Design a protein around this ligand. Structure first.
Ligand SMILES: [Mg+2]
Ligand SMILES: [Mg+2]
Length: 342
DNA sequence: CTAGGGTCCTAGGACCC
DNA sequence: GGGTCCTAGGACCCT
């Protein structure tokens, strides 16, 4: 009863697309991200930039101090979406059991697959080869009996490689696996776990489930399970989008309501256009706004509302502005919609 | 020197039983 | 007192 889960993950996805479409960028350090003047961060970088230490989520000013010749690109999201659609179609030739996690990656459940003599290793290789053949982009892959191990495995032989974890290999793999490598164990959790002496899954194996539940709630059960290779989450091909957001960080903090309202007037048409792609009648469950202050505190305020409405968003932003700003500058303004349940 | 697109979990009071 | 809804905040994920 052992499943075969493949995780496919494009290499340096945004950058890889820009090097394909502009071979001049292949061998110089490049990154997709907002400029230092826009107070941007790196979305991703190519391997020439990563050699300097450039990483996703790094402030662009930090990226540029590490790599002064870094070439900064704005991003062509329709080009990324197009490659995404293509690889998802390539996935469908092998199975309908496809759970995309983002543009550039998906889980595949090939447990019941007839391709490649049922070899999940050979399927992942065919899929990566096909992606290369048809998109001239490389992908890496992980093969394992459960989702999270497959996702970890796809990083281990990046780029343009794959890694297989068999059930017999699972205990040795877990023993020294850093907790931080588990998807959903982030910096804050890893630091909490570290300060109680828990660094690896092998450390957590020596822990009592009851203690983990008291100390972390349902997250503690997840930690206990994962540390044992337990991950019963099924590949789910039926997930639906729940929200639509549009937000902008300004190059300088704003201090006047007039400036905030001007920002919203430019954000609203974009929110309407994106909502309309998925809900032509603009019917929604909730709408709301987001402010981020100069001290990086963030507040949202959102409410039940039947249909995207600009004036109510301005009104709500005005209340938030007046009521929760306390004289701080504002670096970000955002609009938000929660979609109806079906 | 700190983005923009999101999902999920938690938690208190409201409301309903 | 128990469910569920409403709401805000925050960890976390991808690039
Ligand atoms: Mg990737
Ligand atoms: Mg990915």
């Amino acid at each position: 009863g052992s499943r075969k889960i493949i995780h496919v993950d494009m290499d340096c996805f945004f950058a890889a697309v820009e090097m394909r479409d502009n071979p001049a960028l292949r061998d110089i350090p490049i990154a997709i991200g907002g400029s230092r003047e826009r107070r941007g961060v790196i979305s991703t970088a190519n391997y020439p930039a990563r050699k300097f230490g450039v990483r996703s989520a790094m402030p662009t000013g930090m990226a540029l101090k590490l790599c002064p010749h870094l070439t900064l690109l704005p991003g062509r999201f329709d080009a990324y979406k197009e490659a995404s659609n293509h690889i998802r179609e390539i996935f469908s030739r092998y199975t309908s059991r496809i759970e995309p996690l983002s543009l550039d990656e998906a889980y595949l459940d090939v447990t019941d697959s007839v391709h490649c003599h049922g070899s999940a290793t050979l399927i992942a290789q065919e899929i990566r080869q096909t992606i290369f053949n048809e998109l001239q982009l490389t992908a890496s892959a992980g093969v394992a009996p459960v989702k999270f191990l497959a996702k970890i495995a796809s990083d281990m032989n990046k780029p343009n490689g794959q890694f297989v974890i068999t059930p017999a290999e699972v205990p040795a793999f877990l023993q020294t696996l850093p907790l931080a490598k588990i998807p959903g164990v982030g910096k804050v959790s890893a630091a909490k776990l570290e300060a109680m002496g828990l660094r690896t899954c092998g450390d957590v194996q020596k822990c009592d489930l009851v203690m983990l539940l008291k100390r972390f709630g349902k997250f503690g059960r997840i930690l206990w399970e994962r540390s044992q290779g337990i991950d019963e989450r099924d590949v789910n091909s039926e997930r639906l989008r729940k929200s639509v957001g549009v937000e902008r960080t300004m190059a300088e903090d704003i201090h006047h309501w007039s400036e905030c309202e001007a920002i919203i007037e430019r954000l609203y048409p974009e929110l309407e256009r994106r909502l309309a792609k998925v809900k032509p009648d603009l019917l929604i469950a909730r709408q709301g706004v987001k402010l981020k202050f100069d001290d990086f505190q963030q507040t949202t305020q959102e409410h039940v509302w039947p249909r995207l409405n600009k004036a109510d968003l301005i009104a709500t932003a005005r209340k938030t502005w007046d009521e929760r700003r306390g004289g701080r500058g504002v670096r970000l303004v955002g609009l938000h919609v929660t979609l109806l349940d079906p």
